[PDB]
């Protein structure tokens with residue numbers, strides 16, 4: 001209900017908590033460290049998917065075109081792409097895999113279609129996000145050092161990107177609704193913002209974790225009653241809490257946001 005509540009939550013969070021709760025239709029905004037840089041981790045996959053869909057909308061790409069999968073493409077935590085070595089996958093299926101289960105090789109196979117991390121960054125800049133910097137592919141995009149902006153975003157920037165790509169018309173209506181359905185089908189966020197959020201809200205989200213001290217969760221919140229959605233951007237970096245502990249913080253971020261709805 002206030003900015004103070006998130007700053008208080010940070011104290012028990014173990015590290016650096018960044019939260020942006022934003023209601024574009026009213027201009028309401030709440031959070032904490034909303035303009036500081038945080039490692040994106042796997043949340044970079046959300047702008048990656050939007051960049052792909054934008055190129056599809058422009059006719060420079062097809063969701064039905066197929067990308068070849070080679071053994072050298074496979075890296076850790078790639079549950080769908082590892083089954084297609086020696087054949088190909090549609091771009092649409094690559095997008096879905098990287099989004100809803102965080103297929104890492106899927107991300108690496110999509111990136112060259114939008115000219116890699118520099119191409120992702122240029123897309124974000126053209127669309128209005130001048131903070132987010134996408135520099136490396138997987139797994140090294142999960143590296144973070146303070147003062148090193150590579151593969152970082154800010155809670156405000158990523159809430160902005162949720163608004164641009166899901167709510168504005170950066171994307172065609174078919175693309176923006178497919179992107180939404182992918183977030184709604186996310187498989188990795190059940191213990192995170194969703195677990196704290198109140199009944200009556202449809203959640204689409206995308207998560208990330210470095211497995212040691214960082215967990216991120218970005219979400220769109222549509223009222224099932226219909227009406228104007230909220231965006232919720234959460235980055236927890238350098239926490240003493242492990243993944244389950246950081247899940248508990250993300251859950252509590254959902255509980256605070258839920259009271260202000």
Ligand SMILES: *C(=O)[C@@H](NC(=O)[C@H](N)c1ccccc1)[C@@H]1N[C@@H](C(=O)O)C(C)(C)S1
Nearest residue numbers: 041042043077101102188207208209210211
């Ligand atoms: C993106 O952040 C991905 N994270 C990793 O690949 C890490 N190396 C990793 C951390 C913990 C367990 C396994 C791998 C994917 N997003 C994470 C998440 O959303 O929690 C993931 C575990 C689903 S993998």
